[PDB]
Write a protein that binds this ligand. Sequence first.
Ligand code: NA
Length: 219
Amino acid sequence: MFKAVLFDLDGVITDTAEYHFRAWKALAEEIGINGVDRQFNEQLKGVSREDSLQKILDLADKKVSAEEFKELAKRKNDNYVKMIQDVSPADVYPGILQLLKDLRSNKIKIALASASKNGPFLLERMNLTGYFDAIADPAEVAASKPAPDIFIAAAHAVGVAPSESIGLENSQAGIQAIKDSGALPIGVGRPEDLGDDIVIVPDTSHYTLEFLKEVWLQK
Ligand code: NA
């Protein structure tokens, strides 16, 4: 039987992408740049804070000093941190609290494998801290998704190998990272995005202990 489940945060436990988008849009309005919409925002996902800002400036060929650039970037982060003060237990995705309860009661380890610099804080705001055995620190990995480093780190932190683990993700890069770690992926989304060679469920309500056990047996 699998010994651990490795969770991403965004797209699995809750939505942080909406708050990043609102913070970038507010920044662009402040500096007078048009075109930061949700389609455009697809180009900012999984990209560094600095590269995202540059893509926004390039919409208007807008030049700023190195100083101004550093401070516009920090300003957007400050706004994002303000916005997530309102996250609550009601923001947890369907199925996820019941899964955490069932994993804990069956002595299966629970770890976070997220790029979020605010993971510990967000789990505290959602009242989930007491379910998690470890949180991998994204500041300590040498390579980001699709590299396997953050999934290796999450597994190791709870005393298991990835090969003993299931990983849950909604992104192409995260699924590849789980695959290359040695863990078993179960995606949430559609195979058109995530692949034909893994099990995929259409939404998080399908993530049940019974289903995870079925997928592990059949792998
Ligand atoms: Na995700």
